[PDB]
JSON list of C-alpha atoms and ligand atoms in Angstrom, two decimals:
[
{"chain": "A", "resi": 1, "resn": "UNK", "atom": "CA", "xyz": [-0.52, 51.28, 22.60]},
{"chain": "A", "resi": 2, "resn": "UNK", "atom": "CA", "xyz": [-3.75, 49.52, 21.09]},
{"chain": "A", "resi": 3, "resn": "UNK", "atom": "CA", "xyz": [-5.95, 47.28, 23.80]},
{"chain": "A", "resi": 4, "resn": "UNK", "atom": "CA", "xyz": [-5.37, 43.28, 22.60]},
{"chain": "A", "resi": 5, "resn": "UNK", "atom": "CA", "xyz": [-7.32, 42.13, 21.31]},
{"chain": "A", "resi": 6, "resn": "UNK", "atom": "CA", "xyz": [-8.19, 44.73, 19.15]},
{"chain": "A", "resi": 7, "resn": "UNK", "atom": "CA", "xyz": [-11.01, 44.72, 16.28]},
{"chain": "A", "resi": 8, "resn": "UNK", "atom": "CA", "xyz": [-10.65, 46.85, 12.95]},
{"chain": "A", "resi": 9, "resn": "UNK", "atom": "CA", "xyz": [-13.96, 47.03, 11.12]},
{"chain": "A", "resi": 10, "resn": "UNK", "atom": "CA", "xyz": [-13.28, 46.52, 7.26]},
{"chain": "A", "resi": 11, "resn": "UNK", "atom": "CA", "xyz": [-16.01, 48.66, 6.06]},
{"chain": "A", "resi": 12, "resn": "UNK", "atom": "CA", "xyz": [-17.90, 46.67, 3.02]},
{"chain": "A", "resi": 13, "resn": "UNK", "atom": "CA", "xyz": [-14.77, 43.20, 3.42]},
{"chain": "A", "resi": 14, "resn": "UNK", "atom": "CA", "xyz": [-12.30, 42.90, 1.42]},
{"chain": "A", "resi": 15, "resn": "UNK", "atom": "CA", "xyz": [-11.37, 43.52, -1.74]},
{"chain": "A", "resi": 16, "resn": "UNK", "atom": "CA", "xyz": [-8.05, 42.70, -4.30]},
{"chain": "A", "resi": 17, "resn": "UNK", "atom": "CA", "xyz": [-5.78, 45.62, -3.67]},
{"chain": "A", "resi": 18, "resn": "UNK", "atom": "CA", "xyz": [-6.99, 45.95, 0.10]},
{"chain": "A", "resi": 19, "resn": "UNK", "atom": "CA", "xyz": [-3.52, 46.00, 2.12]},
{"chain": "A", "resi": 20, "resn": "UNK", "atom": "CA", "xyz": [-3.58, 45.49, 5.86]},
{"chain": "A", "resi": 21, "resn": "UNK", "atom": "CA", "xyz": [-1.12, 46.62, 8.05]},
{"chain": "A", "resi": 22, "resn": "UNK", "atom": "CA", "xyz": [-0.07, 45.16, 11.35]},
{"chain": "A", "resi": 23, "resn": "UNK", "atom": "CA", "xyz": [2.78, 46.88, 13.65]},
{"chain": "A", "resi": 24, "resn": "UNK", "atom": "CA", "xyz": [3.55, 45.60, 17.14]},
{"chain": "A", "resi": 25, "resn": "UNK", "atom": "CA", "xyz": [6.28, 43.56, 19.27]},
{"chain": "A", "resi": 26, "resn": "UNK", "atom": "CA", "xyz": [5.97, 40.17, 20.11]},
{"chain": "A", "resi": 27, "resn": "UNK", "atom": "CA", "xyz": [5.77, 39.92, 24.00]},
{"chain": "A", "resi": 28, "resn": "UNK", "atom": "CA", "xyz": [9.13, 37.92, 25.65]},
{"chain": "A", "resi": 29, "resn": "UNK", "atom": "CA", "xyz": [7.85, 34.89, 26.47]},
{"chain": "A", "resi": 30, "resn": "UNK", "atom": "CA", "xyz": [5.23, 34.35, 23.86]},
{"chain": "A", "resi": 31, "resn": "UNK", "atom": "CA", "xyz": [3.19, 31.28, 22.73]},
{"chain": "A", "resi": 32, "resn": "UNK", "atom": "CA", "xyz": [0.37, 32.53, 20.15]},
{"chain": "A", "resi": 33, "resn": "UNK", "atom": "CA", "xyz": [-0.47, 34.97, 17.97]},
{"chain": "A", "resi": 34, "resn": "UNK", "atom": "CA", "xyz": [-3.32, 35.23, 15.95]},
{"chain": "A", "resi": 35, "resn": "UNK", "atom": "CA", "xyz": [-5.33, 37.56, 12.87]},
{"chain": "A", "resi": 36, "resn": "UNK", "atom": "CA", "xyz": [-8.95, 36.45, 12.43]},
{"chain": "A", "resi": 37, "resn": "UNK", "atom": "CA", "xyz": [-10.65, 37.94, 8.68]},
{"chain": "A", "resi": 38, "resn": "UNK", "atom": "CA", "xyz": [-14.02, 37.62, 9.52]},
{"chain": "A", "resi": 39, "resn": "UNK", "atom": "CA", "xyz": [-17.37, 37.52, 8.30]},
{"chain": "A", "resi": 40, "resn": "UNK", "atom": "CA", "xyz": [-19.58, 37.13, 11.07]},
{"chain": "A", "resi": 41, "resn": "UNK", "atom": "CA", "xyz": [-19.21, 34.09, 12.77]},
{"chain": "A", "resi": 42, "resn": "UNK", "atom": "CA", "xyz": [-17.36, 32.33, 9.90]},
{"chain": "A", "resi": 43, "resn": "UNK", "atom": "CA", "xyz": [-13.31, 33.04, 10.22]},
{"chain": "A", "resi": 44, "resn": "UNK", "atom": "CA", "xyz": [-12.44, 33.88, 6.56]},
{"chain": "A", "resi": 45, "resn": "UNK", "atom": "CA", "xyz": [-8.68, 33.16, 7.48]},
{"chain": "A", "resi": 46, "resn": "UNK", "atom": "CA", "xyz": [-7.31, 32.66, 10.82]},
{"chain": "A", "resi": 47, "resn": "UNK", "atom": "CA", "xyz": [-3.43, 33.35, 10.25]},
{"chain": "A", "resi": 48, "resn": "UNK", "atom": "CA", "xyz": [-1.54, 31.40, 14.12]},
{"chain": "A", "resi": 49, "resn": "UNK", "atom": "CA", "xyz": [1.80, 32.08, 15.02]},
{"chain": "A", "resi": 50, "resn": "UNK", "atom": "CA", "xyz": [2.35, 29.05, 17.23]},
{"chain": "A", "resi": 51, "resn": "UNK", "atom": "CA", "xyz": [5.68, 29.62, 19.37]},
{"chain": "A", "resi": 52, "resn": "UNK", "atom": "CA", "xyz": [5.29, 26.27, 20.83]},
{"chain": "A", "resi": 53, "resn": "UNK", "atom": "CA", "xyz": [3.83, 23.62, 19.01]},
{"chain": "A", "resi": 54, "resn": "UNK", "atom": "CA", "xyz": [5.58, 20.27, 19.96]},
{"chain": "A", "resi": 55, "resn": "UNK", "atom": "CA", "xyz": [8.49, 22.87, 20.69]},
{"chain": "A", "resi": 56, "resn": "UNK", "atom": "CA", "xyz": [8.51, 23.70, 17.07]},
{"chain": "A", "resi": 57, "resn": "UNK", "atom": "CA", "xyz": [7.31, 27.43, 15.71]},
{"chain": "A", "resi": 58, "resn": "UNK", "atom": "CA", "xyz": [5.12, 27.11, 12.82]},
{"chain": "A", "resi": 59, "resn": "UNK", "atom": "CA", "xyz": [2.38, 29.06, 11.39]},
{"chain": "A", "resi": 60, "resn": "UNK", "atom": "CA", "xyz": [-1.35, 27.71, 11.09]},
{"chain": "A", "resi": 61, "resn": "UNK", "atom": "CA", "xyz": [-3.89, 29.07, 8.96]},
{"chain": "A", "resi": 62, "resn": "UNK", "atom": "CA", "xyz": [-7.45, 28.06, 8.81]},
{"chain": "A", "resi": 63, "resn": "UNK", "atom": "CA", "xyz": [-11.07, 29.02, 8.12]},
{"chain": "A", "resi": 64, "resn": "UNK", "atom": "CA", "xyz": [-13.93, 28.37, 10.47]},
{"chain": "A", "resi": 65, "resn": "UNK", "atom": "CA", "xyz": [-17.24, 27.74, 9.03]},
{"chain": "A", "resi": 66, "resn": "UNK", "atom": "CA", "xyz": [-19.96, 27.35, 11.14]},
{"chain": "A", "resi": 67, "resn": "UNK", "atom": "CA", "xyz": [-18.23, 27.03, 14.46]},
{"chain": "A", "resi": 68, "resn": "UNK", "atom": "CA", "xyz": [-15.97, 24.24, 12.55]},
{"chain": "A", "resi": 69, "resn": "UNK", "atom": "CA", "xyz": [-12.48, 24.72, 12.01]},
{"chain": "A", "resi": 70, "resn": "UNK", "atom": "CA", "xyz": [-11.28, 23.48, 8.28]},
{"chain": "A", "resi": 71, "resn": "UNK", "atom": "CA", "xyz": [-8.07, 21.60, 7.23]},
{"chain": "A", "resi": 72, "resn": "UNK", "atom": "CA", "xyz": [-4.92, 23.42, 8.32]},
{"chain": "A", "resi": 73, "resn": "UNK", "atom": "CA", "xyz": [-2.42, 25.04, 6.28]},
{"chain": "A", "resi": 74, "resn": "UNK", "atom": "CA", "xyz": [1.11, 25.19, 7.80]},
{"chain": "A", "resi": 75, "resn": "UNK", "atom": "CA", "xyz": [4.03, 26.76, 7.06]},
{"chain": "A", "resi": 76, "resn": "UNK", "atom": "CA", "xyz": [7.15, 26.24, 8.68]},
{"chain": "A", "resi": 77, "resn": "UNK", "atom": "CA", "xyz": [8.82, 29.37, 7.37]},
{"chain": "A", "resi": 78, "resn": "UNK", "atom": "CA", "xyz": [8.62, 31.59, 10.64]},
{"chain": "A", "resi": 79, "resn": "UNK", "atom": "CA", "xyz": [10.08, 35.41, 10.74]},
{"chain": "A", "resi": 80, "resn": "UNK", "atom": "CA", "xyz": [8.48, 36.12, 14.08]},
{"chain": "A", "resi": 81, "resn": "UNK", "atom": "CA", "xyz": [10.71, 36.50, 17.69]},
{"chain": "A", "resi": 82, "resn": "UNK", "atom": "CA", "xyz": [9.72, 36.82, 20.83]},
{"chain": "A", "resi": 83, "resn": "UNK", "atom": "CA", "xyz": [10.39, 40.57, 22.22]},
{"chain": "A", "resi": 84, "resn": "UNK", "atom": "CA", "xyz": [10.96, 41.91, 18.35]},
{"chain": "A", "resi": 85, "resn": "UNK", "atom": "CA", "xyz": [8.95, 44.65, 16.44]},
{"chain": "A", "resi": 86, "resn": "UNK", "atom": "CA", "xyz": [7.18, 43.60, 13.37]},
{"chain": "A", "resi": 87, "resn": "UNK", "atom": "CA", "xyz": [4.93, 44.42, 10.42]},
{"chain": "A", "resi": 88, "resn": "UNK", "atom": "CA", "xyz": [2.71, 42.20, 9.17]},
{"chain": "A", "resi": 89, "resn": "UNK", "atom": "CA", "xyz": [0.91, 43.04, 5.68]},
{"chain": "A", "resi": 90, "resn": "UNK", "atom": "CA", "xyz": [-1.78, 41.36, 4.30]},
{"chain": "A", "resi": 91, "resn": "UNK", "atom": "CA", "xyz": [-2.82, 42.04, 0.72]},
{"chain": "A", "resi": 92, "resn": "UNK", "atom": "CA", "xyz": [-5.97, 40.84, -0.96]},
{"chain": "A", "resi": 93, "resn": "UNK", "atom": "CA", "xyz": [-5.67, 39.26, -3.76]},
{"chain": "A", "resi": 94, "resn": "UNK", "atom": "CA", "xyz": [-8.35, 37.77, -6.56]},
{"chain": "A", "resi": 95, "resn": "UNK", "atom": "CA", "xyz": [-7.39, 34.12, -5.23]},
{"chain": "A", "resi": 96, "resn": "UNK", "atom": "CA", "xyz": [-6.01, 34.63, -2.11]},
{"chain": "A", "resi": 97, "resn": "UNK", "atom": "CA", "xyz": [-4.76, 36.69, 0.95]},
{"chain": "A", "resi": 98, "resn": "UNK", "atom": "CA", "xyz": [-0.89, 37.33, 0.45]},
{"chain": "A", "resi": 99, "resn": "UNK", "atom": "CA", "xyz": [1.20, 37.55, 3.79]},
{"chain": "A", "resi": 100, "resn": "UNK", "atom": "CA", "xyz": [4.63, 39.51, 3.98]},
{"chain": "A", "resi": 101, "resn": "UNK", "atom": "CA", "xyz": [6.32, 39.96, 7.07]},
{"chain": "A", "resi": 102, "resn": "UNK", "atom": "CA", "xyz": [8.82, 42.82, 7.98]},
{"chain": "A", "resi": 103, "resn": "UNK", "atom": "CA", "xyz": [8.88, 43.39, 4.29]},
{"chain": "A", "resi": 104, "resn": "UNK", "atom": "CA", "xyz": [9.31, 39.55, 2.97]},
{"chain": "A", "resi": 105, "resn": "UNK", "atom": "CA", "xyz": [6.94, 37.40, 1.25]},
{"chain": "A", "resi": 106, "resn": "UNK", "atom": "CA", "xyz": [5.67, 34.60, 3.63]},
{"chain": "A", "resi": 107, "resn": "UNK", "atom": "CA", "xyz": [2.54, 32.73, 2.54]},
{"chain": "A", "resi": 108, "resn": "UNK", "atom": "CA", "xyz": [-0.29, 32.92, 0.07]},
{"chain": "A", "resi": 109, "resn": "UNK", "atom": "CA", "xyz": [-3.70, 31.29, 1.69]},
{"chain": "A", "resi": 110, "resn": "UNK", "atom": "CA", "xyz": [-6.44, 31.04, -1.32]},
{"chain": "A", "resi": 111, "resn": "UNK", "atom": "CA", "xyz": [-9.92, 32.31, -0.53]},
{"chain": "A", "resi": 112, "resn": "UNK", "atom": "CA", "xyz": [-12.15, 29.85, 1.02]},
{"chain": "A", "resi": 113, "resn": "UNK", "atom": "CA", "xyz": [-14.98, 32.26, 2.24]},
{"chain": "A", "resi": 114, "resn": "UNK", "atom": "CA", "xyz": [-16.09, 33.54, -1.55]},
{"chain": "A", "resi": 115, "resn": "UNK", "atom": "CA", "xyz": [-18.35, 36.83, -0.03]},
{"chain": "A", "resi": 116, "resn": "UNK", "atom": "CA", "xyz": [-14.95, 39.21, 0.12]},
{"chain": "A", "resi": 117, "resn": "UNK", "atom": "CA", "xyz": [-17.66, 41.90, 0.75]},
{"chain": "A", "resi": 118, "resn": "UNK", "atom": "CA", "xyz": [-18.56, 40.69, 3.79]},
{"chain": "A", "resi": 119, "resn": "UNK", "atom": "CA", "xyz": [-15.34, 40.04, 5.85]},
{"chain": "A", "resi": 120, "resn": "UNK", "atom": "CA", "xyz": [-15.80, 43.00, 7.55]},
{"chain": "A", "resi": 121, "resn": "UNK", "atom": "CA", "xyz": [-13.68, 42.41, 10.57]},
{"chain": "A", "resi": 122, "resn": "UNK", "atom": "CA", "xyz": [-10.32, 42.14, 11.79]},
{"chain": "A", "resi": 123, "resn": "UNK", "atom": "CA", "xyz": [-9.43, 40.80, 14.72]},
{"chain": "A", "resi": 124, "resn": "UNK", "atom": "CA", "xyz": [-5.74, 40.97, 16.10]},
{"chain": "A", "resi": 125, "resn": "UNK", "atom": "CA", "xyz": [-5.40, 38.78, 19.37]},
{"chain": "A", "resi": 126, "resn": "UNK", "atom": "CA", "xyz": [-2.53, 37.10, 21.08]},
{"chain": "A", "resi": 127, "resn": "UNK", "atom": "CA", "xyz": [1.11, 37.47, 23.02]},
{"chain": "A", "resi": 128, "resn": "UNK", "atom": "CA", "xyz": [1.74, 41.26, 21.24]},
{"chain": "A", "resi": 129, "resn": "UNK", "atom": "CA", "xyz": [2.23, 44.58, 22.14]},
{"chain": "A", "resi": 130, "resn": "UNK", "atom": "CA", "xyz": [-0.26, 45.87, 19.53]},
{"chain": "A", "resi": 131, "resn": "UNK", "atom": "CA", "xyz": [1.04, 49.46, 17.32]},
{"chain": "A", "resi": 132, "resn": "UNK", "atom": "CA", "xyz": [-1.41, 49.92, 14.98]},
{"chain": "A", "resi": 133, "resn": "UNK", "atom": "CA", "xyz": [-3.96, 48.21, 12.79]},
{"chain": "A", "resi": 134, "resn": "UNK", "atom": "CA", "xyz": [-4.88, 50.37, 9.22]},
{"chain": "A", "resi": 135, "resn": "UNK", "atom": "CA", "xyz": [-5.57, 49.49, 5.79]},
{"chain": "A", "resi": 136, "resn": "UNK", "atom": "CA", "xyz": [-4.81, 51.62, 2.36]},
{"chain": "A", "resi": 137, "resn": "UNK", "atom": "CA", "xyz": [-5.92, 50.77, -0.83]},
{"chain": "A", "resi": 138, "resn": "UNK", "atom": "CA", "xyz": [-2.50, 50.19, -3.55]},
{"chain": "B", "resi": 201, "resn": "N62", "atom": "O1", "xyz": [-5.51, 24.31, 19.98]},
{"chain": "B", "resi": 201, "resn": "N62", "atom": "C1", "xyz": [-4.89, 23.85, 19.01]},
{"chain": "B", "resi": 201, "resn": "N62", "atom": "N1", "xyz": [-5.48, 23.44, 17.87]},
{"chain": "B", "resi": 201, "resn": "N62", "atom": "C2", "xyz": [-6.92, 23.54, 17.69]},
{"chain": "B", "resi": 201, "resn": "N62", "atom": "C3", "xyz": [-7.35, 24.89, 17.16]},
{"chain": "B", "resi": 201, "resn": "N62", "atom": "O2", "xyz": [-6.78, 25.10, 15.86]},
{"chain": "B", "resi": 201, "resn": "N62", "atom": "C4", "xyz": [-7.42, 26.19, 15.15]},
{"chain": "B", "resi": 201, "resn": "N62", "atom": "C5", "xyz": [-6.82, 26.26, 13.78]},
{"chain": "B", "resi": 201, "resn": "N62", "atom": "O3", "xyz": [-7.15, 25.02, 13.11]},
{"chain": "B", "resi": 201, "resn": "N62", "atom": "C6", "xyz": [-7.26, 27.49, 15.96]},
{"chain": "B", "resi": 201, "resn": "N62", "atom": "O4", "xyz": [-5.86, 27.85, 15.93]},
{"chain": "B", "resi": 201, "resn": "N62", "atom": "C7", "xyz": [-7.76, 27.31, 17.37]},
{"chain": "B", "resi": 201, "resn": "N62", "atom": "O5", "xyz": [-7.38, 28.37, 18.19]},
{"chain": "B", "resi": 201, "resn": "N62", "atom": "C8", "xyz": [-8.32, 29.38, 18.32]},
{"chain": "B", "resi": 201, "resn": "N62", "atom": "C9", "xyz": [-7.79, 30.57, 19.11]},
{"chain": "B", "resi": 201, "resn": "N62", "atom": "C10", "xyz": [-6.52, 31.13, 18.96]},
{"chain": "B", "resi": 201, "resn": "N62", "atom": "C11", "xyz": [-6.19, 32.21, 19.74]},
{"chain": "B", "resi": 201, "resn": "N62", "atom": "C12", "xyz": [-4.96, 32.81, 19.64]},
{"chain": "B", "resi": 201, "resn": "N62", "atom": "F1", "xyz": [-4.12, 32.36, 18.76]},
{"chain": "B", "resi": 201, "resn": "N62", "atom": "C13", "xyz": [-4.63, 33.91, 20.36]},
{"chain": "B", "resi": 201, "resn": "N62", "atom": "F2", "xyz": [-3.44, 34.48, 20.22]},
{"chain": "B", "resi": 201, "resn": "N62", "atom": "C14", "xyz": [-5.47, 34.39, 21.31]},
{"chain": "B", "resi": 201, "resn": "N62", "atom": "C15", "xyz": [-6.70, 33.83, 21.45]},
{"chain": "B", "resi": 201, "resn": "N62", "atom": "C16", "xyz": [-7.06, 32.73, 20.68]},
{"chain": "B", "resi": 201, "resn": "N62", "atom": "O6", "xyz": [-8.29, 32.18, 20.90]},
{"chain": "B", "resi": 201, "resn": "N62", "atom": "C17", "xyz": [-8.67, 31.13, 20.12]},
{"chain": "B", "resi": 201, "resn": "N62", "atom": "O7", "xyz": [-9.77, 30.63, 20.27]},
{"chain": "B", "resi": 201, "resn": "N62", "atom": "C18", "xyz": [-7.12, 26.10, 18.04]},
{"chain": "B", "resi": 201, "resn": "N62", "atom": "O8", "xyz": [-7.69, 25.92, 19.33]},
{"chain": "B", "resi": 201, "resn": "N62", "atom": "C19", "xyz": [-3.44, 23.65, 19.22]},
{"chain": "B", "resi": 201, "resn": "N62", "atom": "C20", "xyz": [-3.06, 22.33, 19.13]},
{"chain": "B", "resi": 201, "resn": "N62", "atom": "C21", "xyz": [-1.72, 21.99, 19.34]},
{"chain": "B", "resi": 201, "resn": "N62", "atom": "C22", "xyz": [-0.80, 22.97, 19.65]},
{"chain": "B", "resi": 201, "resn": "N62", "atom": "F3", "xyz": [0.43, 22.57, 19.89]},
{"chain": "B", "resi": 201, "resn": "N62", "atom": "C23", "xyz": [-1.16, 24.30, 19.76]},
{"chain": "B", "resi": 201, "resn": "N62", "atom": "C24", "xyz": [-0.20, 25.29, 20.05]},
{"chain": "B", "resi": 201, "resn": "N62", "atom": "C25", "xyz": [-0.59, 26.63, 20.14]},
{"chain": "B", "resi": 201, "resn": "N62", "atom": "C26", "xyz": [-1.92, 27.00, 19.93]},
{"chain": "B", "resi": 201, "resn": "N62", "atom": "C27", "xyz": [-2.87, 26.01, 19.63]},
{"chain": "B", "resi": 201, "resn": "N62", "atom": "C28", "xyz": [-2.52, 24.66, 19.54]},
{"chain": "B", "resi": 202, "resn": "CL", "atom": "CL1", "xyz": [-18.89, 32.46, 1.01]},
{"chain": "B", "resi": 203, "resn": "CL", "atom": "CL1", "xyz": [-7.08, 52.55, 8.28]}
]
């Protein structure tokens, strides 16, 4: 229901007790997924879904600073599926952005970009059916 890719301006960044909410399906045959916190430029943390990497599924989180892309952070622990609904939540933390899927704890990724207050974009890209994109304060 939401064009992909799809950007949600995060008025002022981020901030610890910022949650944000990701609903959509994962397309049938997908390959990538990917969440971009950014400020400006710079990608804050770039959260991958890889379907297919060396026919393995992992997830790889980075930061991009300066057109460069950091050292990767992968976890292996992968709750997506190809054709299935899901709900990712991100919640800022003081020290770094905690990741739940459908409801389960899935990976912490500490703050790189220190300026919270000005990752004040969203961008949700990939092989989805996109639902909706919101964030609440808890
Ligand atoms: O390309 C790979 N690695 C280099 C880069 O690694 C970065 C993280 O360190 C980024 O993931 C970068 O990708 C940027 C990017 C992703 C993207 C996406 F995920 C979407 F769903 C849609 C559009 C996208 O456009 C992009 O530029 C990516 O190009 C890569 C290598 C090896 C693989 F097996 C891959 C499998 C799936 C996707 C990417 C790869
Ligand atoms: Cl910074
Ligand atoms: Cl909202």
């Amino acid at each position: 229901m939401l064009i992909v890719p799809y950007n949600l301006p995060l008025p002022g960044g981020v901030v610890p007790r910022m949650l944000i909410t990701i609903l959509g399906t994962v397309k049938p045959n997908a390959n990538r997924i990917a969440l971009d916190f950014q400020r400006g430029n710079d990608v804050a943390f770039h959260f991958n879904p890889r379907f297919n990497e060396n026919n393995r599924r992992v997830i790889v989180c980075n930061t991009k600073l300066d057109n460069n892309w950091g050292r990767e952070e992968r976890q292996s622990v992968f709750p997506f599926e190809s054709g299935k609904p899901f709900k990712i939540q991100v919640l800022v933390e003081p020290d770094h952005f905690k990741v739940a899927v459908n409801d389960a704890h899935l990976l912490q990724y500490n703050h790189r970009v220190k300026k919270l207050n000005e990752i004040s974009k969203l961008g949700i890209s990939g092989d989805i059916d996109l639902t909706s994109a919101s964030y609440t304060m808890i």
